[PDB]
Structure formats: C-alpha cells, structure tokens
Design a binder for this molecule. Sequence first.
Ligand SMILES: [C]C1=C([C])[C]=C2C(=[C]1)N([C][C]([O])[C]([O])[C]([O])[C]OP([O])(=O)OP([O])(=O)O[C][C]1O[C](N3[C]=NC4=C3N=[C]N=C4[N])[C]([O])[C]1[O])C1=NC(=O)[N]C(=O)C1=N2C(=O)[C][C]C1=[C][C]=C(Br)[C]=[C]1
Ligand SMILES: [Zn+2]
Ligand SMILES: [Zn+2]
Ligand SMILES: [Zn+2]
Length: 751
Amino acid sequence: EKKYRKCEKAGCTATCPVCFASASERCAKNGYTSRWYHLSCGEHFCNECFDHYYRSHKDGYDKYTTWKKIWTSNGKTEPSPKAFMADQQLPYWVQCTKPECRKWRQLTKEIQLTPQIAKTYRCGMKPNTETSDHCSLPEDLRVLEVSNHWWYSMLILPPLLKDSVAAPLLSAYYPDCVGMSPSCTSTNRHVPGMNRYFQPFYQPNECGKALCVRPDVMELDELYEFPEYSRDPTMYLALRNLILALWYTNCKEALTPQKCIPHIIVRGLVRIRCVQEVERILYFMTRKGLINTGVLSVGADQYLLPKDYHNKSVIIIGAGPAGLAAARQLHNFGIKVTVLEAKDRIGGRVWDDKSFKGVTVGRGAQIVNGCINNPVALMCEQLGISMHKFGERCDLIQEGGRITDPTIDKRMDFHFNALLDVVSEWRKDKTQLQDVPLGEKIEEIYKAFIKESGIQFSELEGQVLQFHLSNLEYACGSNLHQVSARSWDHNEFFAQFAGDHTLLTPGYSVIIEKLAEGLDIQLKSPVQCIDYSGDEVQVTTTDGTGYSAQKVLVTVPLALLQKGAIQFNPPLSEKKMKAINSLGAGIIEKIALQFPYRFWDSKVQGADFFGHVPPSASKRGLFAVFYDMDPQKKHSVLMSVIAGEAVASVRTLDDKQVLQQCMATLRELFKEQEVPDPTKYFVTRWSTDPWIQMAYSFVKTGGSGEAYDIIAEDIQGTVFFAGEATNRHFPQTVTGAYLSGVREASKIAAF
Ligand SMILES: [C]C1=C([C])[C]=C2C(=[C]1)N([C][C]([O])[C]([O])[C]([O])[C]OP([O])(=O)OP([O])(=O)O[C][C]1O[C](N3[C]=NC4=C3N=[C]N=C4[N])[C]([O])[C]1[O])C1=NC(=O)[N]C(=O)C1=N2C(=O)[C][C]C1=[C][C]=C(Br)[C]=[C]1
Ligand SMILES: [Zn+2]
Ligand SMILES: [Zn+2]
Ligand SMILES: [Zn+2]
C-alpha cells in the first residue's frame, strides 16, 4: 500500500496535513497515510480515522451508522464520512471575549461549544470557567487563511448551523436546505413569546404576504451584494435567517455582531467565516431597514453602521411619517440629518387630538390595515402599546331608525363586487389610452345588468348599494368618476399585509413623536427652493433662511408637488411631472363628537362602528360610518367620515353647520330615542390645509401604478423622494409612507 504526506486535493495550501480526528489507534497524526481526506485547506483526516467510522468491523461504526440514519431521514444532504466529520468530530473555534484581544482559538476536541462559552471565553482558559499572558500568543496560522475568498472555494461542504434560533420557525423545511444541521435534535424538535404579528418567513409554496422572506431562496438584491453565494446559498441563508429570528425575538435593542456570535454554533474553521460574514450581512440588512429599525434609538458612538457610511449630510423636507422614518434611519446610521417642516408641528397627516377625556382621537390617520409584518405593529411592540382589532359587525342604520336586515347588506355588497369583477374583466385587454373612469364603467355595467335581468330592487336595497359605493369612494379618496378603471386597485398585484385590521387606540402620534425624539427638526420652516446645481444642495425657506447638504430628501404631499410649491433648480423632468400629475390627490374629512353618555349602547350593543344608509344619492358619503372611539366601552366619543361628493358639500359649510348636519343625522339614526347634545367636537379641514391639501393618493383615469415608481426615482443620486404617493406596493398609508422613508434612507446610505 502506497502512502502520501500531501493532501488528496490538487492545489490545497496545507503543506503538512495533520489529522484533526485522531479517532483510530493507528491515526497517521501528521505523517503518511493512504489518503489525506480534505475538508478545508486547514482541516484534514487520515484514512485510518476514515475507516475507523466507515468500515463495519471498526470501533467507530455504530456511531457513524446511528448518525447516518438520523441524517438521511431528517435532511436532503448525502451522508458521508466527510459530512459526519464536519458535523460531529471537527474541533470548535472560539474568539477571546477580551475586547482588546478577540483572537481565534481552537478548543480541545471533546469541548462542545455553547453560547455560554462563546460569551465567556478568554485565551488559555479552561472552557466553562487571571493574567493576559495567553492573549499575546499568536493565532494559529490557519485562522488568517479563512478571510480569503479562495479559502471558501476550497471548502468542500457548506457549513450547517446547530441550535439556530430560526429553527423553531422553519420546521416545514428540510434543515439543510436552510443551512441547519439535520442531526440537531433541537432544530428537529407559535414561537413562545414572539409577537404574533411577526411572521418573517414564508411557509413552503406560500406567497402573497407582505414583507415575508423565503428562508430557502436568496433575493436578487442579496445575490447582487453577495454573489459568492449564487451557486450554493446554504451558508448565507442560515445567517440571514438567524439574524431575522434574533431581531424579532428582541426588537427593543440594536442587534449587533457580538450578540449574534454566540448563536452561531458550527464546528471547524468555517465558523470563523460564518462570524465574519454575519457581520457583513447584518450591516446590509440594517441599511435596508430589515432589522434594527422602527423607533429604536442609539446614543452617540453607538451608530448602527460602520464609520464608512457616516460621511454624508442630508436635508429632509417634511416631518410626516416618511420624513421622520428617513431621519430616524439616517440618524441611527450615523449620518447628519436636518428636517425642515413647514407647519408648527410634526406628524403631517398624523395629527392626534388629546383633549377628549379618556381617549385619543386622530384628526388624520388612526387605522392599521394588516398587522402581520407591518412596521407599525413592530413599533407598537417596541413602545409597549396595544392596537384594537376591529370586530366584523356593522349594522346599517337607516334615517328613521330602522336597522337594515343583514341579508340586504350582504346581497347588495354581493351585487356591487360583481360589478367590480366585470370591470376587472373588461380592463384585461385595455391600454392606458383606452382607460375609462371607474364610476362611469360601474354605472354602465349596472344599467346593462338591470336592463338585461329585469330585476327590481326596493328603495332600501338601492340606498344600501349607494352605501357600498360610498365605501369604495372612501377607499379611493374620490368620487369614482376621477378614478382609473384600469388601475384603481393596481397595488393588489403585489403581496399585501396580512392579518388584523386595527384601530391604533393610542394614536399614530405616539409613534411619530418617538421617531422624532432628539432629531434636529426645524418647525415653521417651509421650503421654497431646492437648488442642486452646485457641489452641495442649497435649500431656502420662505423667509430666506438657507440650508445646505450633500443630499436632499423631499417627502411633501402629492398635492404640493402638483402645485409646484417648491421650485427645483434644475427643474423636475417632464417624465416626473407627468407621473406626479397622473395620480389624484384623494381627500376625506373627519368629525369627532363627545357626548355626556354612550347614548348608542342599547341599539349598537358594543359593535366598533355602525353604518348610515344614505337617504339619497345627493347624501352619499356624508357620515357613512360612525366609529365608537373607546374599545373599552367607557367613554362617549364618536368619529365619522366625510367622503366622495360629500367633501365638496362641506367645503362651504362652517364647523357649526357641519356639526348641525351630523347631529341631525344622528337624531334620524336614533329616531326612536333621545340623543344628547355633544359637548366637544372637531371638524377637519385637510383639503384646505396649505401644506397638505389632501388625505391620500389614487390613480386617475389614464394613469398607471408605475407613476409611484417614477416619483420615487432619485435625481442624480442627489435629490430623493419619499411619501405615500411614492410607494407603489403600499400607497396611501402611514405604513407605506414609513417604508418609503426607510427605502430612501437605504438608497442614501449606500453612497
Ligand atoms: C388626512 C388623513 C385622514 C383624514 C385619514 C386617514 C389618512 C389621512 N391616512 C393617510 C396617511 O395619514 C398618510 O398617507 C401619511 O400620513 C402620509 O405620510 P407622508 O407621505 O410622510 O406625508 P405627510 O404625513 O402628509 O407629511 C408631509 C409633511 O411635509 C410637510 N411639507 C409640505 N410642504 C412642505 C413641507 N415641509 C416643508 N416645506 C414644504 N414646502 C407637511 O407639512 C407635512 O408635515 C390614513 N393612513 C393610514 O395608514 N391609516 C388611516 O387610518 C388613514 N386615514 C384613514 O382614516 C383611512 C385611510 C386609509 C386606510 C387604510 C388604507 Br389600506 C388606505 C387608506
Ligand atoms: Zn487520523
Ligand atoms: Zn487539503
Ligand atoms: Zn485573548
């Protein structure tokens, strides 16, 4: 039998392979063997130790055969002596936890690495236990080899993590397909204590859930950033999944490399590569706003990105959700940020009234549509505040006081949705130039349906159909004759936020105020001119005050871009202006009313809301739904909404006149009983608020959902745009505005 002292692998860098296993009595140690089996450039085992586990007549056979059965029934990865060695016998490596040392040390071969050892190890210490003489000793020369790409090229098998925090969430997958060891009994065993709104991973073959990630497939931007994992994403996926599991396990503190490291358990020098890589992936995911986000705050010298990203300055225009999200992100990253806000307050279309006894009443936004993976739900968790999931019951009460039978409600809802299905079919073969107003198409289809079918609706059924029409006008922010039939629901092409629809009972202002805390925000500083013709951006407010920065982020409402209230030099492009003008500045208003007692309790019986059947088409959208603003049923505040054509009818009414129409409406809805006078109220005027002039965007006839992407496109890597009218997947909402700010901070930090 011929024996060799060199590695089996052509080009291996080990000039003298030594056996890490020493499992056989005849282990070749550092000498000659019939084959030196290669795991990495630094790790080899001799043929005697190979046979020790592999051959049926040898001592190690039962342990290998036992491992092999577990491996093949739990994973898709082939068993082999090399796979066994890497999973069960290869020694562990650990970093000294002395902060000024951090050197990599090999543990003796019977020590099994735990998070506790990784948190407490110091050079030369017996694991699980004075002078720093041992720290000065050089690292094993194989340690430095690991930081080269060629070392990864020469590693024969991907690493497989043990006891990953992500494993309880991934039991539907083969563990090795997500970078976890099939032999782990804890991996192969609702995550207790994890917020039920945090569902970061798609289940197999699952789609259609906003902000979920496939645990078994890399996304294109991950591959662009880490092309070394394109052939085999195993090792990247385990680290990214681990990072996400750790972040959602404790979203109230910054997830750092040092916090991840004890949770990376895997044998061999590859652990060094895993620890180096998890730090790079963490910064990539931090920049993108996937972790270390929300209302997390850092102190100075505790910034979330390394000093490389810090050498920038930004001016942010507008302190609503999008602007404050960008400002918080960039500030946390370590980038200089100044926020210029036109009004005397922050929040934009978030504006909460705190003067009603016992409740908080939003003048603007207050609902969260779809809490699962929603950053608003994350921020509620971070702040320790609760949302109220809406109940389904909403009786449609008529003027005169009768309650509409629920089968009428459902039947006319059925007919209305069927009208929308015909629009959905009609538009399939239509170009933008062939677009038609949604409301016009609905009316045409309805009239054809009546003529064709001969059906005769009662007056009440027709009024209930008007109710459902007004709900769609509310959702679009407009009468439907301005809304695109092709594009009105364009964003539903994309995965939407699943789960509960809630009332944010403490109000979005709590989140707004925490985002803004400690930031440099200039109030009463409306921007008039943005000049990016020079080496730095020059921003001038209406009183002549100048600000400068390398980059500028514009988050003003769609209506203010349409009016051109800010002059741009050089001007916005024709293509950008066409997109801006293709979207509609939708609008609703709100009224809130406080009463001496809950006069509606006997009739409404604890429902979250009740509907108002419009008595005529001229009154469609006028107080269509009344919201009980105390889910705990103690205080007496109702809120109602003005939508569609009704917005134009209240434009020329003062607040007292609107209040009078609302009280006359309520006394009709509760005709059979007494209704007390309200003791406090507000009527919103968003449509004439000079720096807002809207509630939320929609696509106008002839427009495309692509307009949202076009408005979001940066100019020259210098002028950036965020805001609800820049979020194609998630238009209109505080959530989409927030995410658009996170998106732009990511773009800005990448330079
Ligand atoms: C108004 C309203 C109402 C009444 C209601 C509601 C609403 C609203 N919503 C919406 C929201 O809110 C929005 O979207 C947001 O807020 C947005 O954000 P942004 O984008 O950030 O914006 P703003 O806020 O507006 O902010 C901006 C700012 O900027 C400023 N400026 C301007 N200009 C200027 C300035 N500065 C300086 N310079 C210059 N020049 C202004 O001032 C401002 O501040 C909503 N949302 C949600 O999410 N939720 C709710 O609840 C809401 N709402 C209602 O109610 C309903 C609606 C909806 C829902 C659901 C869905 Br799916 C959709 C929709
Ligand atoms: Zn050996
Ligand atoms: Zn080798
Ligand atoms: Zn040390």
